[PDB]
Design a protein around this ligand. Sequence first.
Ligand SMILES: OC[C@@H]1O[C@@H](O)[C@@H](O)[C@H](O)[C@@H]1O
Ligand SMILES: OC[C@@H]1O[C@@H](O)[C@@H](O)[C@H](O)[C@@H]1O
Ligand SMILES: OC[C@@H]1O[C@@H](O)[C@@H](O)[C@H](O)[C@@H]1O
Ligand SMILES: OC[C@@H]1O[C@@H](O)[C@@H](O)[C@H](O)[C@@H]1O
Ligand SMILES: [Ca+2]
Ligand SMILES: [Ca+2]
Ligand SMILES: [Ca+2]
Ligand SMILES: [Ca+2]
Ligand SMILES: [Ca+2]
Ligand SMILES: [Ca+2]
Ligand SMILES: [Ca+2]
Ligand SMILES: [Ca+2]
Lengths: 114, 114, 114, 114
Amino acid sequence: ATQGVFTLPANTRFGVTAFANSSGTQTVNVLVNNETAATFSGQSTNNAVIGTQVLNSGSSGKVQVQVSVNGRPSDLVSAQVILTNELNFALVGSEDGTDNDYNDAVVVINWPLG
Amino acid sequence: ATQGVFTLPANTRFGVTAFANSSGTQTVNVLVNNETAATFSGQSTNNAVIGTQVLNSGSSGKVQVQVSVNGRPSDLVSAQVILTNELNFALVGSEDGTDNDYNDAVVVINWPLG
Amino acid sequence: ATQGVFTLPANTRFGVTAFANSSGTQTVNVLVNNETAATFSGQSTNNAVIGTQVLNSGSSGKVQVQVSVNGRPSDLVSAQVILTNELNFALVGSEDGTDNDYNDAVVVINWPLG
Amino acid sequence: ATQGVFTLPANTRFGVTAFANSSGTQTVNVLVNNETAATFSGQSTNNAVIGTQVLNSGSSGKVQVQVSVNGRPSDLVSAQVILTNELNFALVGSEDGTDNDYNDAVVVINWPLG
Ligand SMILES: OC[C@@H]1O[C@@H](O)[C@@H](O)[C@H](O)[C@@H]1O
Ligand SMILES: OC[C@@H]1O[C@@H](O)[C@@H](O)[C@H](O)[C@@H]1O
Ligand SMILES: OC[C@@H]1O[C@@H](O)[C@@H](O)[C@H](O)[C@@H]1O
Ligand SMILES: OC[C@@H]1O[C@@H](O)[C@@H](O)[C@H](O)[C@@H]1O
Ligand SMILES: [Ca+2]
Ligand SMILES: [Ca+2]
Ligand SMILES: [Ca+2]
Ligand SMILES: [Ca+2]
Ligand SMILES: [Ca+2]
Ligand SMILES: [Ca+2]
Ligand SMILES: [Ca+2]
Ligand SMILES: [Ca+2]
């Protein structure tokens, strides 16, 4: 199934934050309505916050996360969770190798903000 | 129901990261085996990262997140989500006021690292 | 924070299923737009499906689960999960006593159907 | 990533319940320690419960859900979510066709019981 794609509330600010846990340099791309809106990169095996940004979900609300290492797309796993019918997290894990820890880049999207 | 309390695997490193979305200064305290292991403070209405750290869950694996604003305990919501039977997120929202957006401090705990 | 309340898409069929795990007879009420739309009762300590029903979320999409044991409301915990940006689960646990297993009545709401 | 595989605490009773939403007859196999422990089958486009059972997670705790329709495995999506650090849901959706509703067989595993 498709992973890393989320329908957010339209026209709404959200946070997107990426963590790295791999020997490989991660590159995380965040697309809003199919166009790159943010790119984060770094290399850490200790959960460094390689990027954090506030974006607007735009007219369609479509947000997609893509991860690559040295130009190779990582395999993604994702889900969205909603607490108290209001607080949202869209969660992404990714695997760049063979150990299947799925933490090589971890991406958390949160809304609402403010 | 109790919120913000998670049982991690014993002796395991985990990330903890806090974001703020409120007029009030947030104080986030992270307890491991009932003792304070990290404390973050800050104020933002734009999802600023007010702290990030790597901790070890110790022999008990018990991790607790508490949030207060000017000494007043915030009401918490929480859950844990596991993707592909491997990647764990323990998620906390908190409310310091009347609007019930539950994002006043948002805390993300993730493991495994590395 | 409020628990057991979910906003579904309007005029949408959903499934609701209740399980019991307690010495006490569980009564599960499912409200749509603040009116009872399904009720299930029973006693099991082995996860009996005390009822399952297909309901329509109607014009408001407001669905609320309430649980009681001989008139006494149980304490609720809930969340919603979305898989592949499409498949929705609204989850409820409840506690009727002191052990905090929160499985005394468990309720799962799922959509879309068909 | 692998989907439909969950590690439960060892030697723990769990419930498993399957629902159908498709023109096709669903076959759901539940493995414990890599051997079939339960098999459900049925056909419904209205979320009928096609099987429910209580099982033991056994010495390894490894539980796997497989779904087959019209002679081929369906594509699976899954996650585990834990409420109040106590109540566990392991959730599976599956797609037997092209519409990508992922509800064709829906499987809910819950623990602890009793
Ligand atoms: O050296 C650390 C390792 O780097 C890559 O191989 C990762 O895929 C692996 O999970 C681990 O983080
Ligand atoms: O000024 C911004 C506001 O600050 C506090 O009142 C918050 O509880 C509220 O959700 C909002 O963030
Ligand atoms: O007798 C079994 C017990 O019945 C009630 O006390 C429940 O609250 C408890 O969790 C347990 O299921
Ligand atoms: O309308 C019946 C249909 O049966 C199969 O095609 C399913 O894959 C589809 O989602 C739908 O349920
Ligand atoms: Ca890896
Ligand atoms: Ca890694
Ligand atoms: Ca607030
Ligand atoms: Ca706020
Ligand atoms: Ca109980
Ligand atoms: Ca019980
Ligand atoms: Ca389908
Ligand atoms: Ca279907």
